[PDB]
Amino acid sequence: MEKFQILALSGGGYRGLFTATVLKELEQEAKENGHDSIADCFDLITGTSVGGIVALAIAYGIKVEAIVDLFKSHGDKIFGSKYSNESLKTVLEEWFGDSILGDLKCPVVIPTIDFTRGSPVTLKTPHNPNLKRDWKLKIVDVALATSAAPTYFPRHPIGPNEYVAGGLFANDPSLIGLHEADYMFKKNIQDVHILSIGTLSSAAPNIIDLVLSSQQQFMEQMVKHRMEPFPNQFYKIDEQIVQASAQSDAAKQVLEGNGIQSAKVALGKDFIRNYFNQPSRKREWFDGPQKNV
Amino acid sequence: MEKFQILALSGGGYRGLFTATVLKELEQEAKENGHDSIADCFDLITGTSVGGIVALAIAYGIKVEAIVDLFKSHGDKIFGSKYSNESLKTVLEEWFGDSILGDLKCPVVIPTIDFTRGSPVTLKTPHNPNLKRDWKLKIVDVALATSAAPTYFPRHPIGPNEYVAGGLFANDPSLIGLHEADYMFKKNIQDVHILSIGTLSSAAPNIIDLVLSSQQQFMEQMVKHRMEPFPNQFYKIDEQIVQASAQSDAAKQVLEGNGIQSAKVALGKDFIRNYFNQPSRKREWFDGPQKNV
Amino acid sequence: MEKFQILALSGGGYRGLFTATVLKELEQEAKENGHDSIADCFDLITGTSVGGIVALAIAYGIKVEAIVDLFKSHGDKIFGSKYSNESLKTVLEEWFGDSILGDLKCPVVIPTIDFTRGSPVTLKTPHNPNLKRDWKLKIVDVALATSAAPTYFPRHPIGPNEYVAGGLFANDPSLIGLHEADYMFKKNIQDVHILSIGTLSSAAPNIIDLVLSSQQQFMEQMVKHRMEPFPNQFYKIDEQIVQASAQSDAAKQVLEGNGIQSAKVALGKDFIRNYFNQPSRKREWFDGPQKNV
Amino acid sequence: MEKFQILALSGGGYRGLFTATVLKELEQEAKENGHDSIADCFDLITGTSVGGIVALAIAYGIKVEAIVDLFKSHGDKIFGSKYSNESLKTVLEEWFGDSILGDLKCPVVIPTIDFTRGSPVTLKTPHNPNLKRDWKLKIVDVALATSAAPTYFPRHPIGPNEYVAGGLFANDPSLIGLHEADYMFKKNIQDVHILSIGTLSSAAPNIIDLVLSSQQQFMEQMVKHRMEPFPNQFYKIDEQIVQASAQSDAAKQVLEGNGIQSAKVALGKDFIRNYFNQPSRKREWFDGPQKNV
Amino acid sequence: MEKFQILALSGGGYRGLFTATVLKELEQEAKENGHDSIADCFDLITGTSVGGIVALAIAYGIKVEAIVDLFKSHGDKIFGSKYSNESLKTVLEEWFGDSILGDLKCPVVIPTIDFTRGSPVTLKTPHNPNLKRDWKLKIVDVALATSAAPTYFPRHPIGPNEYVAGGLFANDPSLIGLHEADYMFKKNIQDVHILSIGTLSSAAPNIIDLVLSSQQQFMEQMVKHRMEPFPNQFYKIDEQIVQASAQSDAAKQVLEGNGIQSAKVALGKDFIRNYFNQPSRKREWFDGPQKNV
Amino acid sequence: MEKFQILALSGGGYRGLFTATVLKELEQEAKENGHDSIADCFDLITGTSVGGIVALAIAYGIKVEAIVDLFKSHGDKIFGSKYSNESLKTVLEEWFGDSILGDLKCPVVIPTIDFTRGSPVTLKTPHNPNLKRDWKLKIVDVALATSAAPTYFPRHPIGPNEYVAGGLFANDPSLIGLHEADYMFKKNIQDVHILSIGTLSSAAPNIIDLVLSSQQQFMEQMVKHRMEPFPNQFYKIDEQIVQASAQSDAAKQVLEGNGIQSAKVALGKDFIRNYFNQPSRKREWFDGPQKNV
Ligand SMILES: Nc1nc2c(ncn2[C@@H]2O[C@@H]3COP(=O)(O)O[C@H]4[C@@H](O)[C@H](n5cnc6c(N)ncnc65)O[C@@H]4COP(=O)(O)O[C@H]3[C@H]2O)c(=O)[nH]1
Ligand SMILES: Nc1nc2c(ncn2[C@@H]2O[C@@H]3COP(=O)(O)O[C@H]4[C@@H](O)[C@H](n5cnc6c(N)ncnc65)O[C@@H]4COP(=O)(O)O[C@H]3[C@H]2O)c(=O)[nH]1
Ligand SMILES: Nc1nc2c(ncn2[C@@H]2O[C@@H]3COP(=O)(O)O[C@H]4[C@@H](O)[C@H](n5cnc6c(N)ncnc65)O[C@@H]4COP(=O)(O)O[C@H]3[C@H]2O)c(=O)[nH]1
Ligand SMILES: Nc1nc2c(ncn2[C@@H]2O[C@@H]3COP(=O)(O)O[C@H]4[C@@H](O)[C@H](n5cnc6c(N)ncnc65)O[C@@H]4COP(=O)(O)O[C@H]3[C@H]2O)c(=O)[nH]1
Ligand SMILES: Nc1nc2c(ncn2[C@@H]2O[C@@H]3COP(=O)(O)O[C@H]4[C@@H](O)[C@H](n5cnc6c(N)ncnc65)O[C@@H]4COP(=O)(O)O[C@H]3[C@H]2O)c(=O)[nH]1
Ligand SMILES: Nc1nc2c(ncn2[C@@H]2O[C@@H]3COP(=O)(O)O[C@H]4[C@@H](O)[C@H](n5cnc6c(N)ncnc65)O[C@@H]4COP(=O)(O)O[C@H]3[C@H]2O)c(=O)[nH]1
Numbered sequence A, B, C, D, E, F: 001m002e003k004f005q006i007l008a009l010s011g012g013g014y015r016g017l018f019t020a021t022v023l024k025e026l027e028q029e030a031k032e033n034g035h036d037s038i039a040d041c042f043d044l045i046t047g048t049s050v051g052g053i054v055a056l057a058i059a060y061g062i063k064v065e066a067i068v069d070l071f072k073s074h075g076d077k078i079f080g081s082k083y084s085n086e087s088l089k090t091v092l093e094e095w096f097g098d099s100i101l102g103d104l105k106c107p108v109v110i111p112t113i114d115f116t117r118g119s120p121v122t123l124k125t126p127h128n129p130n131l132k133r134d135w136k137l138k139i140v141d142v143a144l145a146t147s148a149a150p151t152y153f154p155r156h157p158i159g160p161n162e163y164v165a166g167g168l169f170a171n172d173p174s175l176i177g178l179h180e181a182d183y184m185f186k187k188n189i190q191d192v193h194i195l196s197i198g199t200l201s202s203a204a205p206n207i208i209d210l211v212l213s214s215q216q217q218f219m220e221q222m223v224k225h226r227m228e229p230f231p232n233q234f235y236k237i238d239e240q241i242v243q244a245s246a247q248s249d250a251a252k253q254v255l256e257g258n259g260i261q262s263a264k265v266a267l268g269k270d271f272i273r274n275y276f277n278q279p280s281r282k283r284e285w286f287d288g289p290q291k292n293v
Helices: A013-032 A050-060 A064-073 A086-095 A139-146 A173-183 A204-226 A249-267 B013-032 B050-060 B064-073 B086-095 B139-146 B173-183 B204-226 B249-267 C017-032 C050-060 C064-073 C086-095 C139-146 C173-183 C204-226 C249-267 D017-032 D050-060 D064-073 D086-095 D139-146 D173-183 D204-226 D249-267 E013-032 E050-060 E064-073 E086-095 E139-146 E173-183 E204-226 E249-267 F013-032 F050-060 F064-073 F086-095 F139-146 F173-183 F204-226 F249-267
Strands: A004-009 A044-047 A108-114 A119-124 A192-196 A234-236 B004-009 B044-047 B108-114 B119-124 B192-196 B234-236 C004-011 C044-049 C108-114 C119-124 C192-196 C234-236 D004-011 D044-049 D108-114 D119-124 D192-196 D234-236 E004-009 E044-047 E108-114 E119-124 E192-196 E234-236 F004-009 F044-047 F108-114 F119-124 F192-196 F234-236
Touching: A004 A050, A004 A173, A013 A050, A013 A064, A013 A249, A044 A050, A044 A173, A050 A064, A050 A086, A050 A108, A050 A139, A086 A139, A108 A139, A108 A173, A108 B204, A119 A139, A119 B204, A173 A192, A173 A204, A173 B204, A204 A234, A204 B108, A204 B119, A204 B173, A204 B204, B004 B050, B004 B173, B013 B050, B013 B064, B013 B249, B044 B050, B044 B173, B050 B064, B050 B086, B050 B108, B050 B139, B086 B139, B108 B139, B108 B173, B119 B139, B173 B192, B173 B204, B204 B234, C004 C017, C004 C050, C004 C173, C017 C050, C017 C064, C017 C249, C044 C050, C044 C139, C044 C173, C050 C064, C050 C086, C050 C108, C050 C139, C086 C139, C108 C139, C108 C173, C108 D204, C119 C139, C119 D204, C173 C192, C173 C204, C173 D204, C204 C234, C204 D108, C204 D119, C204 D173, C204 D204, D004 D017, D004 D050, D004 D173, D017 D050, D017 D064, D017 D249, D044 D050, D044 D139, D044 D173, D050 D064, D050 D086, D050 D108, D050 D139, D086 D139, D108 D139, D108 D173, D119 D139, D173 D192, D173 D204, D204 D234, E004 E050, E004 E173, E013 E050, E013 E064, E013 E249, E044 E050, E044 E173, E050 E064, E050 E086, E050 E108, E050 E139, E086 E139, E108 E139, E108 E173, E108 F204, E119 E139, E119 F204, E173 E192, E173 E204, E173 F204, E204 E234, E204 F108, E204 F119, E204 F173, E204 F204, F004 F050, F004 F173, F013 F050, F013 F064, F013 F249, F044 F050, F044 F173, F050 F064, F050 F086, F050 F108, F050 F139, F086 F139, F108 F139, F108 F173, F119 F139, F173 F192, F173 F204, F204 F234
Parallel strands: A004 A044, A004 A192, A044 A108, A192 A234, B004 B044, B004 B192, B044 B108, B192 B234, C004 C044, C004 C192, C044 C108, C192 C234, D004 D044, D004 D192, D044 D108, D192 D234, E004 E044, E004 E192, E044 E108, E192 E234, F004 F044, F004 F192, F044 F108, F192 F234
Antiparallel strands: A108 A119, B108 B119, C108 C119, D108 D119, E108 E119, F108 F119
16 A cells, blocks of 8 residues: 555646646655656646646656746747647657657556547556557647647647547546546555646636536546545645735746745645655556566 | 445436436336335436436426426427526426425435536535535426526526536536445445436537537546446446437437337346335435434 | 634625625524524624624624625615715614613624724623723724724724724734633633634735735734644635636625525535534623623 | 743834844843854744844844944945835845855744735745745845835845735734744743844824734734733833933934843843753754754 | 722823823722722822822812813813912812811822922821821812922912922822831731822923933832732833824823723723722721721 | 841032041941951942942942042042033042942942933942843943032943933932842841931022932931831931031031041940941852852
């Protein structure tokens, strides 16, 4: 019985700068405890849309300084269909290149919707004997697929199928982490610790937004309910202070400051600090270039 | 350790003649085994959309002949905002009258969205010591709230709040049943048996439909995954034969016939027949006129 | 032994209708458990600003239906110096009349500032042998003094001294409740249960607002810190859902609905329900018309 | 059980010279009893405003002769927004340089307000296992942030956030000392000894001053009330003689003389002399350049 | 061993309204405890100058409502030599008439200076076998002698001698009370309880004022020193709040309000309330019309 | 129980030749009984005005021949502001030099007034654990401060404060001796023996003189009253013969003859002779260079 820790990077658009600021501060705590990256402290990383461009980068081993550098120097240009995806593609090739999803150092689950069939899809690494087809994809294509919503980006054809943004259906990536730890990893729920670094989003479009918000809250409350018998085993690092804030470079200042303050609040809790004071986790890859089993 | 059985009536619009026909066919077994209604064989009833109306009618003790009579004699008229809700209101008062949600004979969970706050809400009978405010509502108002979607019906103001249809977020009422049996009834998942009598539904609206279908499938697959270690403990009575059917009174014929065939297929499985061959279930009401504890 | 329960009503201006709604739904539980009013379940009541006109009304025995009737029928007119205190005065005489502060059924602490000396003052019922001069005041004058701020109301001269609103300094009436239970009631902090039904408020004025908000948060966090070793012994019923609300009669609707939802959430927690299921509180008055000791 | 002694320096503006004269006299006793500085006799140092530039200097190990030299040779120049923070900045770099807040020899708590979020903040040395982010700051920036009020100094941007003066909210640094000894140090209140070397300050601005004075007195009286059961465990060295004084170099004379007289009065009390006749205090740093634990 | 209680009415000029208001509030406590006047709770009453016009009135049995009526309706006119004492004489005859000093109900000591010899004199009632010549004087003449200072009033010739104001030498009437209790009443100092209701006063004249203030403080500190071994046996009701007051009818308001607040503070202390909860004191007159021995 | 003997040198101006002559005559008995100086027979020495100078000289160990030499050879020159203090300063440096007040061989109390604050001050040797700041002063500065009255000498700035003559307030140094022996030495009054070698002094100035004389007599009579139960324990060596004398070198003759006659009268009383026939007193210094405890 050792703790199965999940990092559920929730977010959307340009508020992602909050998610990368909270992650630069948490990273420091990992280093100071002797880890190579913040991806060595977690057994699973789940993200949706932009949270997936950060989740893949975290698991690949990318320094969080560059994930933040993306949002405060390239954030305007990146974040036909109101965007052309070319700058995002350039930065992602800059980062990854031609690496496949099986080259990640941490198991990830990237939910997304198959527009062709119109059905949920999850792009996962080979962390179970049964996952054998998603480790061959370009990390660039996975990143372009997860962060591709209608009226935001053209749908990305990874292969024969067209995929849209994952936040449309699985707007909470903390239910995916808990579910994946319950059926792929056969983990008892008492051993699951979820850290969800999410953020709040900023007649028909009104209805779509209402449905999306309601569907994120429904799944978040389900995760909170399943983790109530075990105290402090699900903690969400949200900017609950911006809603209490009595008061785009200025917006960068507010986002950065909110991220730093939320990470400071989180590091003051011993159970959050206990995510990073452990021996480096050992992975079990069942396929791909890093096959251990 | 006795089996906690859940009835998850999934349904949308007129295809409800399928859900009411399968329920009318299962009533036959329920009575032949010596029960008063099909609501005496289940510990929880969850439904969204028209399923909610059928779920409330099932739990209230209404004969399933009249629930079917609603769909093949009043189905066209009932199923500004393309409908006026007056015929549905008349039939619901005809059925219920001025009964409160605490007069139900079976615990129910009716998910719905608070349009005012734009957040998930569940209307629940007083079945837990913690449910103390939803047993006072009109069953008519609950039925008008659950089956009230934009472009279908005006939003129903039960009280100070306006509510929209529950199928928008909790499109699968079998995840609600399983969760309730986990966070309210403190039931071990091996003791939970879910019977989901659902049916298949018939650029922006395309995206909304895709998102709704994807969100129903995601939650359905989560329920199927959590119930795989226990064989045959989650069975869905779906019209998987209409998709294999090589070929509005005619539509009534197809819906009825499909319901009868699906119920015939279900009754051929001993584990489905074991839902109805048990002593009548004893309820524990913690508030309202039927308070037992 | 006996749990010392405190009700810390925080309410500024028109969003007092939230405080009056949460208390109409908490009195229901109070009556359903067999109490005469919601003032029989608490051993101390503290309010500042409108929370004091509600705190005095609660302790006097006024039905909470009329406290709500004040905010949705007289709220605009009541809430020179932008407001003639005459309306409130009429409603307060219609409620109280010529009753003195010693006629209250529950000990209250009403903080306020002496503008003459410019120093903190607390108007308290004679609930300690050392309180002997504030039980002689008009409840009407106390209510007009607590809810009297510059640029809102003229300063009220209760006697030879002029008093201004208490929210200016003691913006959190939950630190006053905890302190009074600590220095007047000689209560061990483990026996103190605080229920704070507050609400969020809506270059020099900016600085004043910033200072007031900072001073409310500082004292609130001090109360939260002193009550962390004892779980769930300080619960604040705040409209944390309006800050999550994706969406003046309309404002009345939002305030009412938020109050009802927050009270519903609070009543779902057993420790909140345990405030009202206890034997009636026996008072010890050490002076005034009701001196029992 | 050994005494936990707190030094709560309160000093607004030029009447800080009082706080420096009282300290130089109290350091004499400190040295005569065999200590290196007056920071070796205390287990916590709290300060607000100028009292924070003195509190940091005391804890850093700066000789109190230079803290007094600041007020009688540089006091006019230091004490757009009526004051260019440049002078103070030069003197603070001349004192500290590039030392971080983790290089202090005594735990300090410097309250301040985050203008960006508009919320209370406390800059603390790493004296608890939960304080891990404020030991990295420049002492110069902390000093420029604590002593930065509107209409006095421009707001100081330590990092991504702008901070204003701490005296605006936490005008009494003796409630902060008592609270920190209660929630961070887990100290029994009978073991806490507070020595507060404060001083008295000299239509809208009138209201702001009234609110600030009322908020200082409220918190001071709360500290006095919590420390009444333990005699002489909270002593405030205030210039209560200048208000009894029957009668800017002349002002320097009055301030100096008042400080010397108040320190003489304080040293005549054996319980004050017992703060300095003890073995040197041993610190427990849980992070930073001096981490011992 | 029963407590010997002394009332030392210190005061001066028109601030006497403070002393008369603190005494109306303390009187109420005497009545509420069942005494005829505030002169039945004390064994000795010492006053200087105006405090003597109040001390004589208190001991004579005059209602304190009229002593206050003197200061807020006749205060300007009463308070050649800037002030011909005709109005004061009229009001004193109105009060007393032709009563001798031996008709007082409480022993009093009125210090004064014999201008003829230029030596201290005390006008005392026959409360010792050795006091046999002062009980024959007019109370009007004693009142006109005690409140008669140069540059204020002409010197009053009671008999063959001219007398000036007593505040010139015995500016503190609490040292006189303690001394009398020590040599006339042969009381142990542990049994002496002094309640001093005084107030603060508002090149050669500067020197005279400095000397007078220094001589009042010297004697006050001597009384405080002799009463330190016995806690709370010397309490001075001073307006220490007007020196902390951040802010001639207005002056009447401040004086009255300060008196009411100081009396409220005093009545909150159980040892002050214990002055009035005792059986009525029994006097021993050794000469005059009320001779008991 | 051994006798606590006090020497209260009262004096003013050149009449100080009486005190110096009486002291020179008592030195004869002191030496004839085997003591080093007249300061070895007393436990405390209190003086005001020129008495302070003589008191400091007596305690320092100065031969009384030189104290008399000051008054009959330098008396005219020493005794802007009618004097320049330079001759007195020269003679005092001649005597003391750079010795601090802690180098005295006998505890002394020198009353004086702080002109800055306008409050009583006493300069005391470190004779109690609580006296820790007056032993560092120059004896020359103490002597120049005690003997510095307006219209006589410029005010002497010992440090940051200006001091005036002590005879203005504490015109009788025998009440100071008795009080000190009561509040600092914790001596029973039956063990206190006071020997007061004083002398009689020679429209606004008339009032000042009257007040000063009245204040000296008031305190003298208080000392006489407190020492009546113990016979001959307070004896004042006054020139009561010059007032009976039926009849500036001639004035020197009268002063010295009166001193010799008064000392002759005093030495004829056995209780005065018993001050000097005792073993040398042992001092307890609690601070300064002579610290014994
Ligand atoms: N995702 C994935 N699936 C693979 C791989 N190799 C084989 N498969 C198989 O494809 C099946 C369905 O693919 P899908 O992932 O797109 O739909 C998935 C996905 O839409 C959804 N789902 C998967 N993991 C989830 C999760 N952790 N949380 C919430 N929902 C989830 O449930 C569907 C069924 O998952 P399954 O694990 O039982 O079967 C896989 C799995 O058996 C592979 O490399 N990746
Ligand atoms: N101040 C500080 N907090 C840190 C550090 N590392 C983590 N934290 C955590 O940041 C949280 C937020 O602190 P804040 O400084 O922004 O506001 C603080 C401050 O506004 C207030 N507060 C703290 N100590 C106080 C005190 N002694 N007196 C009065 N008020 C105080 O309580 C807020 C929350 O305190 P907390 O201790 O429970 O959690 C800290 C603490 O757990 C750190 O290096 N410094
Ligand atoms: N539904 C309900 N809730 C009540 C009642 N009296 C008090 N409550 C309390 O109000 C809280 C929030 O009500 P909500 O129903 O509008 O949001 C609910 C609902 O949106 C969602 N939820 C509840 N049961 C669910 C379920 N079985 N499946 C999926 N989602 C669910 O979780 C939210 C919080 O659930 P909770 O039970 O822990 O707290 C309730 C509950 O404790 C009551 O009579 N009915
Ligand atoms: N005189 C003195 N006081 C000191 C020293 N170190 C500390 N103190 C303390 O300073 C307090 C006030 O000093 P002050 O001398 O200016 O006022 C003194 C002085 O004005 C007056 N006083 C002291 N001794 C006296 C006496 N014997 N007779 C008459 N009056 C006296 O009482 C005031 C307070 O006395 P305190 O002894 O209780 O407190 C001292 C004393 O405790 C010190 O070296 N000398
Ligand atoms: N005051 C008074 N004195 C009387 C009376 N009948 C006789 N006497 C005698 O006159 C003597 C001196 O008169 P005095 O009161 O004007 O001076 C008094 C007075 O100036 C002063 N004094 C008295 N009581 C005091 C006190 N309580 N506090 C401070 N100083 C006081 O001490 C002087 C001596 O008092 P004493 O009591 O030993 O002797 C009385 C006393 O024996 C009489 O009716 N009143
Ligand atoms: N409030 C009050 N005080 C009374 C009464 N009769 C006597 N008193 C006494 O008046 C003193 C001054 O009270 P204040 O109301 O003017 O300011 C009060 C008030 O400003 C503040 N305070 C009191 N209770 C508080 C509290 N519970 N929380 C926060 N602050 C508080 O402390 C000040 C002094 O309190 P205290 O209890 O030690 O002494 C009282 C109390 O002993 C009375 O009828 N009411």
